[PDB]
């Protein structure tokens, strides 16, 4: 399916510079650079698989809008798919990581603000997350010498709600191991609870407190 | 002089280890940081960046001896080929109240400069397809001017003058003084 096809496609496919018209190459570092770098690398793959399955892939005009990519069949435009790309680092392999997942006051509460199509028109909300391990000019022959800002990069594709948390970072994600984002191990029980919790966030400061309140 | 050496951009894709180029306002800061340091260290200035985002300025510069003679720098970016502005800071924080959202008390700063970028909004590739990749921007011009000399009288945050890039590099805004500008932008 578009999804299985997409995660395996992502799992397959190490950027190390910015190349100029005159051939010169400039190294990156961590200084919103790596995030934009991982979003760029993502465009092609997304285009490739959507197309293979007949999906239109839209990006937003007024940039600050959710979502990074909206995918839908023309036969079914009420079933749009939303893909947001998130990036995080980690200073130690196998140590808990977390992401930010955007606004909880815009579209989630207004259905139309800061989102491309109205919120109701999207059936699923996927997050593609990059977890990179934290680590003058050059010619095309120096590629292996140009110092990279990381020593590895992992990626998962998952549902926004399944990995959302109960605290602002903008919503934060759960504070867990890469493994738990892949495996889908979160705190919310359903998407409804995830959205009830975030549409009503001002009574409650965390999940436990949220549930006593709903009782 | 800092401003001197300081005062004295055709990227076309991101490159991979294996050669693949991926066609494309952060590259502009990217180009910025290394140069700020070089000229700053050439003069013994400590360059510092914000620990929290949404904080002023992008770069603070001061020699460790004196910290009441700092310099604040902000990289701005904007786009149009030969047409009619920037968004500078906010008029209610650190400016109206000396310590809100600025890395250091506003009064530690004897200068606020703006390095600005201006261009015209004009599949993977390989090294040989280099000069065939489609640039998304043309005509990058850049200027280094004082924040107050540039500032306008209208908010979007304080607005700059909406003029042509030369008015920027020469300093032809509308307030007659730094003191006039600050009074006005409360």
UniProtKB/Swiss-Prot annotation, chain B:
Q: What GO MF terms are annotated?
A: DNA binding; metal ion binding; type II site-specific deoxyribonuclease activity
Binding residues annotated for Mg(2+) 1, in chain numbering: 58, 74
Query: What, per the annotation, is the impact of changing residue 58 to E?
Result: Decrease in activity
Q: Which reaction does it catalyse?
A: Endonucleolytic cleavage of DNA to give specific double-stranded fragments with terminal 5'-phosphates
EC number(s) on file: 3.1.21.4
Q: Which residues form the active site?
A: 58, 74, 76
Report the cofactor remark: Binds 2 magnesium ions per subunit.
Transcription as UniProt keyword? no
Residues that, per the record, bind Mg(2+) 2: 29, 58
Task: Write out the entry's keywords from A to Z.
Answer: DNA-binding, Endonuclease, Hydrolase, Magnesium, Metal-binding, Nuclease, Plasmid, Restriction system
The record, for CDD domains, names:
EcoRV-like
Q: What is the effect of changing residue 157 to D?
A: Loss of activity
User: Which cofactors are named for this entry?
Assistant: Mg(2+)
Matching entries from InterPro entries are given as: DNA_rep_MutH/T2_RE_sf, Restrct_endonuc-II-like, Restrct_endonuc_II_EcoRV, Restrct_endonuc_II_EcoRV_Pbac
Q: Name one GO biological process term.
A: DNA restriction-modification system
Q: What does the UniProt record report as the effect of altering residue 57 to A/G in this chain?
A: Loss of activity
Quaternary structure?
A: Homodimer.
- Name this protein carries in UniProt: Type II restriction enzyme EcoRV
Q: Which lineage is the organism of this entry classified under, starting from the top rank?
A: Bacteria, Pseudomonadati, Pseudomonadota, Gammaproteobacteria, Enterobacterales
